[PDB]
Amino acid sequence: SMTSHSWLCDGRLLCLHDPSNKNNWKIFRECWKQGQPVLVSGVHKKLKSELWKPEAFSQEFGDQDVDLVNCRNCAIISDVKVRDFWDGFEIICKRLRSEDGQPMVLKLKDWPPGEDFRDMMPTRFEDLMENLPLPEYTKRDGRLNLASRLPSYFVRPDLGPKMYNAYGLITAEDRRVGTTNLHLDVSDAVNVMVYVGIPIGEGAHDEEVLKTIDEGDADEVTKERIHDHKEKPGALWHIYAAKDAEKIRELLRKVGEEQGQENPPDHDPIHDQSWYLDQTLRKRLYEEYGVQGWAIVQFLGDAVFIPAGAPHQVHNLYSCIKVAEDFVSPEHVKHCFRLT
Numbered sequence: 001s002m003t004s005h006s007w008l009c010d011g012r013l014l015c016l017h018d019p020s021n022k023n024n025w026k027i028f029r030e031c032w033k034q035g036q037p038v039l040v041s042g043v044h045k046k047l048k049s050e051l052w053k054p055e056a057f058s059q060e061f062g063d064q065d066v067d068l069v070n071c072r073n074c075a076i077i078s079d080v081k082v083r084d085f086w087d088g089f090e091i092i093c094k095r096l097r098s099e100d101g102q103p104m105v106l107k108l109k110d111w112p113p114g115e116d117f118r119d120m121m122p123t124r125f126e127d128l129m130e131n132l133p134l135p136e137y138t139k140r141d142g143r144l145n146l147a148s149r150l151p152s153y154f155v156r157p158d159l160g161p162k163m164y165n166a167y168g169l170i171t172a173e174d175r176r177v178g179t180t181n182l183h184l185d186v187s188d189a190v191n192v193m194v195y196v197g198i199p200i201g202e203g204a205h206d207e208e209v210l211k212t213i214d215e216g217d218a219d220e221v222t223k224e225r226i227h228d229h230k231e232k233p234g235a236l237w238h239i240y241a242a243k244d245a246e247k248i249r250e251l252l253r254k255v256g257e258e259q260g261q262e263n264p265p266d267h268d269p270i271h272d273q274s275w276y277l278d279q280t281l282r283k284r285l286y287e288e289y290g291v292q293g294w295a296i297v298q299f300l301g302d303a304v305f306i307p308a309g310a311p312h313q314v315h316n317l318y319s320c321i322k323v324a325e326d327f328v329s330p331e332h333v334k335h336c337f338r339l340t
């Protein structure tokens with residue numbers, strides 16, 4: 001039967017089921033005020049599916065010049081055409097290969113560039129902004145979005161949205177690599193999974209995705225979403241409470257020193273965006289510092305709400321197109337104030 005909401009993460013994560021129900025705020029508000037992330041399912045059913053396909057981005061925008069990142073070693077592939085990324089998104093035989101001959105795992109960097117999404121893609125911009133959940137919080141002029149209403153004593157977010165495009169990590173060695181490394185934002189954000197590409201035939205890798213889920217931190221009900229095989233899984237997130245950010249910096253300073261990095265005692269390993277917490281590091285964080293996080297699998301059409309100040313990292317299971325909007329809720333405005 002259809003219901004308003006359910007729980008994941010053993011009751012610690014709210015999952016809203018109807019992205020457009022006008023009463024969602026009544027359930028959302030208390031979880032948000034406590035500094036928890038929230039998940040909203042079903043946003044893909046509200047969107048124009050033909051606007052969000054890899055082949056359409058390649059046809060319309062393929063002659064633009066871009067840089068790519070090699071996820072495995074952080075090497076920059078400079079000044080290539082954006083079609084060279086899009087045409088290998090799902091079809092592994094058409095995908096760029098390393099010198100050694102393996103298909104690469106690539107991220108498309110800063111595309112569309114800066115604040116240019118609205119100008120470059122006006123029909124995509126309208127389809128996303130009109131269908132965002134919790135619209136009093138997430139729309140540019142929502143009543144509970146302070147972004148347009150604050151003075152210069154507050155860091156204000158850039159005009160959005162921002163698109164995040166990257167291939168899935170493939171091998172057992174790739175399990176310890178991030179798509180986006182551990183970092184935090186001083187604004188709130190909503191991140192929507194608009195497309196998942198699952199390769200078939202030549203370079204399929206379904207067995208290592210299921211291993212990664214079965215051997216990892218995820219709760220039994222999320223494992224009972226993977227195994228049902230009704231919905232496409234896109235990306236594995238880990239999110240930590242804003243109150244635990246300094247304990248995480250203490251662990252990463254200790255691990256940087258153990259690995260022979262030579263860092264001043266004040267340096268900020270979260271701002272550096274250089275670390276991915278693998279299973280070994282997540283267990284050390286729990287046992288040595290007493291810090292627990294939220295392990296979240298973002299499926300097609302899931303919207304992840306990330307509280308301001310919360311450290312987070314992302315690991316793509318399959319090839320993903322994500323679209324994110326920043327906002328400034330009253331609950332978390334302290335995180336962007338420039339004094340004390």
Ligand SMILES: c1cnc(Oc2ccc([C@@H]3CCNN3)cc2)nc1
Binds near residue numbers: 002004005018021023
């Ligand atoms: C048609 C429509 N909806 C259902 O189930 C629901 C869905 C959403 C809710 C909301 C969400 C916020 N407050 N209650 C309650 C019941 N079933 C058939």
Ligand SMILES: c1cnc(Oc2ccc([C@@H]3CCNN3)cc2)nc1
Binds near residue numbers: 227
């Ligand atoms: C409706 C029905 N079926 C689909 O296809 C898929 C394809 C792959 C999965 C993954 C694989 C790993 N765990 N589940 C799930 C659903 N899509 C929409």
Ligand SMILES: [Cl-]
Binds near residue numbers: 121125
């Ligand atoms: Cl467009």
Ligand SMILES: [Cl-]
Binds near residue numbers: 025133135136137
């Ligand atoms: Cl709302």
Ligand SMILES: [Cl-]
Binds near residue numbers: 179180181273
């Ligand atoms: Cl990164």
Ligand SMILES: [Cl-]
Binds near residue numbers: 035331
């Ligand atoms: Cl907070």
Ligand SMILES: [Mn+2]
Binds near residue numbers: 183184185312
């Ligand atoms: Mn982020």
